[PDB]
Design an enzyme around this catalytic site. Structure first.
Site, PDB file in Angstrom:
ATOM      1  N   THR A   1     -13.536   0.008  -2.896  1.00 37.14           N
ATOM      2  CA  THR A   1     -13.950  -1.377  -3.013  1.00 37.14           C
ATOM      3  C   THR A   1     -15.455  -1.548  -2.804  1.00 37.14           C
ATOM      4  O   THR A   1     -15.983  -2.653  -2.940  1.00 37.14           O
ATOM      5  CB  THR A   1     -13.183  -2.252  -2.013  1.00 37.14           C
ATOM      6  OG1 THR A   1     -13.121  -1.586  -0.748  1.00 37.14           O
ATOM      7  CG2 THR A   1     -11.763  -2.511  -2.513  1.00 37.14           C
TER       8      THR A   1
ATOM      9  N   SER B   1       0.812  -1.210   0.000  1.00 33.43           N
ATOM     10  CA  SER B   1       0.000   0.000   0.000  1.00 33.43           C
ATOM     11  C   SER B   1       0.851   1.268   0.000  1.00 33.43           C
ATOM     12  O   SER B   1       1.991   1.254   0.458  1.00 33.43           O
ATOM     13  CB  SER B   1      -0.901  -0.013   1.234  1.00 33.43           C
ATOM     14  OG  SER B   1      -1.645   1.195   1.361  1.00 33.43           O
TER      15      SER B   1
ATOM     16  N   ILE C   1      -8.364   3.060  -3.171  1.00 35.39           N
ATOM     17  CA  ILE C   1      -9.217   2.300  -4.090  1.00 35.39           C
ATOM     18  C   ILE C   1     -10.582   1.999  -3.471  1.00 35.39           C
ATOM     19  O   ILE C   1     -10.682   1.380  -2.411  1.00 35.39           O
ATOM     20  CB  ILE C   1      -8.569   0.954  -4.511  1.00 35.39           C
ATOM     21  CG1 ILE C   1      -7.323   1.208  -5.358  1.00 35.39           C
ATOM     22  CG2 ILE C   1      -9.566   0.121  -5.335  1.00 35.39           C
ATOM     23  CD1 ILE C   1      -6.208   1.873  -4.630  1.00 35.39           C
TER      24      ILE C   1
ATOM     25  N   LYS D   1       2.507  -2.454   6.289  1.00 36.72           N
ATOM     26  CA  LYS D   1       2.581  -2.357   4.837  1.00 36.72           C
ATOM     27  C   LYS D   1       3.987  -2.044   4.331  1.00 36.72           C
ATOM     28  O   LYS D   1       4.412  -2.547   3.279  1.00 36.72           O
ATOM     29  CB  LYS D   1       1.596  -1.297   4.342  1.00 36.72           C
ATOM     30  CG  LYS D   1       0.131  -1.728   4.433  1.00 36.72           C
ATOM     31  CD  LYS D   1      -0.109  -2.973   3.591  1.00 36.72           C
ATOM     32  CE  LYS D   1      -1.559  -3.412   3.607  1.00 36.72           C
ATOM     33  NZ  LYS D   1      -1.741  -4.693   2.870  1.00 36.72           N
TER      34      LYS D   1
ATOM     35  N   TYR E   1      -0.850   0.178  10.508  1.00 36.30           N
ATOM     36  CA  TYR E   1      -1.125  -0.275   9.147  1.00 36.30           C
ATOM     37  C   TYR E   1       0.057   0.100   8.246  1.00 36.30           C
ATOM     38  O   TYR E   1       0.563  -0.711   7.469  1.00 36.30           O
ATOM     39  CB  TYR E   1      -2.411   0.385   8.639  1.00 36.30           C
ATOM     40  CG  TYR E   1      -2.843  -0.078   7.263  1.00 36.30           C
ATOM     41  CD1 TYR E   1      -3.477  -1.304   7.082  1.00 36.30           C
ATOM     42  CD2 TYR E   1      -2.635   0.721   6.141  1.00 36.30           C
ATOM     43  CE1 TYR E   1      -3.894  -1.713   5.820  1.00 36.30           C
ATOM     44  CE2 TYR E   1      -3.052   0.318   4.878  1.00 36.30           C
ATOM     45  CZ  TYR E   1      -3.679  -0.894   4.724  1.00 36.30           C
ATOM     46  OH  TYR E   1      -4.097  -1.280   3.472  1.00 36.30           O
TER      47      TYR E   1
END
Ligand SMILES: [Zn+2]
Ligand SMILES: [Zn+2]
Ligand SMILES: [Zn+2]
Ligand SMILES: [Zn+2]
EC number: 1.1.1.138
Lengths: 267, 267, 267, 267
Positions: free
Chosen positions: A209, A160, A207, A179, A175
């Site tokens: 989703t 990411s 993105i 990542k 996070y």
């Protein structure tokens, strides 16, 4: 097989073809997401796909039906909890015993963080690190042995842009840290499996989703202003990169990272 | 507003298809160079290609014939010296007049160095920076005006891993410096052209384009042992990445860099 | 080959000491700029300093005077045009003549860009590159020859965070590209000069040297919101890094870059 | 939360002075290790120091004694196992009770790996990630709460060049991945703590602290050949950076990383 060799095909369409090959994707639990898109993309290239799921199989079940009907290829759903090594190890054994082999592996483990390091508990930190980082480590070590025994293979880890910069205004250091480690994991493994398999990562930006509704309109507007393309991306805009790394169109690329954030990290 | 939007296609094959689009490649003019492979990969996807040469034209003329009989697409050769802005401005004006417009431009300023900045002269430096850096700038600026007028476009600059690291055996800071500036120029321009065009770069490592003998057979030995994959790369292993950034298979990726060095920048 | 060894001093204060050493700073021309601050810090550590000016003799002369009476060290101003290799070669020749040597050289020459590559002319682009990129190259090559002859040296080029990302909303790709080349120039030279000198870069984010009045109040606010520390930096907040790289307090650090941007690049 | 403002001092020596400030170093417990060097340097600037140890209480006790006797500052040792948050949380507690405050915290996790992902067991992986990665997280989280309360602070995390690249001879992905996470943890926290404290990281390369005998001679030569300086660094060459980040000589630096690897990453 004396090291990894270059594609035998001079044609791009033959390099990209996944016919006679087996690819496995992680998430793909819903007809809308990065995992299902990677599954559709590989399937479109004549690939036999093996998508997994964490809890309920309903989503995977249909994805398979949709994958076999529209692409006319073989597919199957499996239960896998990346946070557990034995689970991953089981995945590989079961997929190999079913399809006979595993050519590419797409790993997309992305459990988010809901706070900063100080506001969050230790448990909160470990949840992200265990799933996002260690979960990737689990899949890699699982397929790794299979790739070594065949002397071929392509591991694509989904990282990411959060592995490059820190998201704002939301705080999610855990996070980002997980990542980031995922990105370098690609580099380091590429060097470790240099004699038999390729390893590369995809770093998606914002993105959509299908959960944008669970996010404040003002927050989204704040994000778009930071995205030079001024919009969220769609999972179908990742399948390309996914197929690229999994197929023979990148037989010399390994240890690389592809940013797909609408130019976010650029600023 | 609007501007920079996602692909309308769900099919990967359709997103890759360059049918109806015009792409120009600067390098192309040799038998197996990075340029002719890009034009090959683009031509294979149904694109009308315009390749350019620096001095002699016999090579690009032959390539044009090759492209037309093996892919049944229209192609034409143009004389262009990246070091001269007028040559690039004329390059763009001419192609548009012959093909209608430019959908994708692939820069390929390839001039090497032969020493460090101390052993080399000031001229030696200006050469590399003028051709590799300013030259890429000339192409970019030249097609940018077209891209803006049209509202679309994709610029793919060919940088190099030398823009990431400094090759050891031989000294070549001028080349390395130029290439690094090339990498950021792609991110910087992706942001400046965020309303009408994407800009991305590819950083190749040691690719055998057909000049193996012009390089000390002993210097290559070292390279081969320093490249994790332990081998030179082939230009045909770059067409995938070129097509990727030129086609609609990457409508959300701009300002990113793709290494293809067999894992070299990993150690 | 003399080879680069570790500082002979255990004490930090001793490592930071620059007594018996000569340093040259190219910016020192104003009251509170990065240059003069770079000189004050080095002079404080007890070093003879040579500062240069493009055409502001008055200012520099004032700097020389204040430097001596306050640090009790020798100082002298010289006229230098970084965009001219001869000017730089001369600067070195003169300094080595008056001071007898140069132990550390701090390259500093900012040629701001006034637009994107599409609005600006080829001339505008060439100027920024010639001054910012080639200018730094000129100082490097000029003093490098001296370091090589002494088997000892330390180059510190002042790049910019602009070499990492692209400033927003102001467009300045020519400026960003140059600075980007400056950062890898440090890496490349660190390797090229490995046997006799260290090279490193500093990447200043938004620093206020007394010209904030040229920027619209509305643009200052936009920037501050993008700076996590939410404020502009001060020249005196870089002297430590300059002295850090110029002294023996970093005898094992070469080919590195230090960001001083209030965390701007973090996001 | 007085916001992070620029150093009030104009003198570099004043900026570097840590008199009236307390610092804590986790490694310090040996003769010539990175930790003790960091302690020494801060001690020399006039800071009250607190070093920790995981088992070598004897060594720590002596370092304290040696510290107070040569620098004339208050020093004390504490037992702390970074792999346990409770141990860290207790470290901060005790130090703040004994010293009254904490201005700078230098974190360090030396746990190392001795195999790749495939050869190593899940346990071997977990151990490294828990100590190296989560350990640094533990320290950060512990001091962080204190920094926030005081509205001031500076966290320095000791990463490794292994966070940027993958060591060639030995296979140590767990270490590399863990170190990589540390680097970005610094960036991420810099932003999260943007209102009260600064966070930065140091990435050391091959630094001989004494165990330069447990390594095969032929192995040393190989590494030395990959290092531009052709030698191992000495722990005393890192105190400059440690003091740089911990003091007011970097009040505008945050989210930055500093490589000290003799240029190893340059290639
Ligand atoms: Zn839990
Ligand atoms: Zn010439
Ligand atoms: Zn490297
Ligand atoms: Zn950014």
């Amino acid at each position: 097989m004396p090291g990894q060799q270059a594609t035998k095909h001079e044609s791009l369409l033959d390099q990209l073809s996944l016919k006679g090959k087996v690819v496995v994707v992680t998430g793909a639990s819903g007809p809308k997401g990065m995992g299902i898109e990677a599954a559709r993309g590989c399937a479109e290239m004549g690939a036999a796909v093996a998508i997994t799921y964490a809890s309920r199989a309903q989503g995977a079940e249909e994805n398979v039906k949709e994958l076999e009907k529209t692409y006319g290829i073989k597919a199957k759903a499996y239960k896998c909890q990346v946070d557990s090594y034995e689970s991953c190890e089981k995945l590989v054994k079961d997929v190999v015993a079913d399809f006979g082999q595993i050519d590419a592996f797409i790993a997309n483990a992305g459990a988010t963080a809901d706070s900063g390091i100080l506001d969050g508990s230790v448990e909160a930190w470990n949840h992200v690190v265990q799933v996002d980082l260690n979960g990737t480590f689990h899949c890699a070590k699982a397929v790794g042995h299979h790739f070594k025994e065949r002397g071929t293979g392509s591991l694509v880890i989904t990282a990411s842009m959060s592995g490059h910069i820190a998201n704002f205004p939301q705080e999610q250091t855990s996070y980002n840290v997980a990542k980031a480690g995922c990105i370098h994991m690609a580099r380091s493994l590429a060097n470790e499996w240099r004699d038999f398999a390729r390893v590369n990562s995809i770093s998606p930006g914002y993105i959509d989703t299908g959960l944008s509704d669970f996010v404040p309109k003002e927050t989204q507007q704040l994000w778009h202003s930071m995205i030079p393309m001024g919009r969220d991306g769609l999972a179908k805009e990742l399948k390309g990169a996914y197929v690229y790394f999994a197929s023979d169109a990148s037989t010399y690329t390994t240890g690389a990272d592809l940013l797909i954030d609408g130019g976010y990290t650029t600023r």
